[PDB]
């Protein structure tokens, strides 16, 4: 149907906008702390601590399959990256502090992304 095509075009355009958001958020992580999944070979206890691991590569895979239907879903995965790190790692660590800085800087980007998603529809 043409209605199904139009819905698919909207999902494609959302995907384009979320790719630009993803790039901008990841630039706020120049150390690349959040680039890849935590390795269970290197942190064998991780899944005892963290039940839903998340990282920028995993989000990019989901994005390229057009797997985010709305901005809320994408924000959920970004918040997991930050929140997981702030639980596993202590306050005094470079990991925790990187997460705080990513959250603070990413807030700016996401605030305008929301306006754009609502505005364009």
UniProtKB/Swiss-Prot annotation:
Listed transmembrane segments: none
Subcellular location per UniProt equals: Nucleus; Chromosome
How is expression of this protein distributed across tissues?
Answer: Highly expressed in testis.
Q: At the top level of its lineage, which domain of life is listed?
A: Eukaryota
Q: Note the position of the cross-link Glycyl lysine isopeptide (Lys-Gly) (interchain with G-Cter in SUMO2).
A: 41
Could you tell me which residue ranges the Bromo domain spans? 9-113
Cite the record's note on assembly: Component of some HBO1 complex composed of KAT7/HBO1, MEAF6, ING4 and BRD1/BRPF2. Component of the MOZ/MORF complex composed at least of ING5, KAT6A, KAT6B, MEAF6 and one of BRPF1, BRD1/BRPF2 and BRPF3. Interacts (via PHD-type zinc finger domain) with unmodified histone H3. Interacts (via PWWP domain) with dimethylated and trimethylated 'Lys-79' on histone H3.
> In UniProt terms, what function does this protein have?
Scaffold subunit of various histone acetyltransferase (HAT) complexes, such as the MOZ/MORF and HBO1 complexes, that acts as a regulator of hematopoiesis. Plays a key role in HBO1 complex by directing KAT7/HBO1 specificity towards histone H3 'Lys-14' acetylation (H3K14ac), thereby promoting erythroid differentiation.
Under which name does UniProt file this protein? Bromodomain-containing protein 1
Give the source species.
Homo sapiens (Human)
Taxonomy of the source species: Eukaryota, Metazoa, Chordata, Craniata, Vertebrata
The gene name on file is: BRD1
């Amino acid at each position: 149907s043409m209605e199904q095509v139009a819905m698919e075009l909207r999902l494609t355009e959302l995907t384009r906008l979320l790719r630009s958001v993803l790039d901008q958020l990841q630039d706020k992580d120049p150390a690349r702390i959040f680039a890849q999944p935590v390795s269970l070979k290197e942190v064998p206890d991780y899944l005892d601590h963290i039940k839903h691991p998340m990282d920028f590569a995993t989000m990019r895979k989901r994005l390229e399959a057009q797997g985010y239907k709305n901005l809320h879903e994408f924000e959920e995965d970004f918040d997991l990256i930050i929140d997981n790190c702030m639980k596993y790692n202590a306050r005094d660590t470079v990991f925790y502090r990187a997460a705080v800085r990513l959250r603070d800087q990413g807030g700016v980007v996401l605030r305008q992304a929301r306006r754009e998603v609502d505005s364009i529809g």
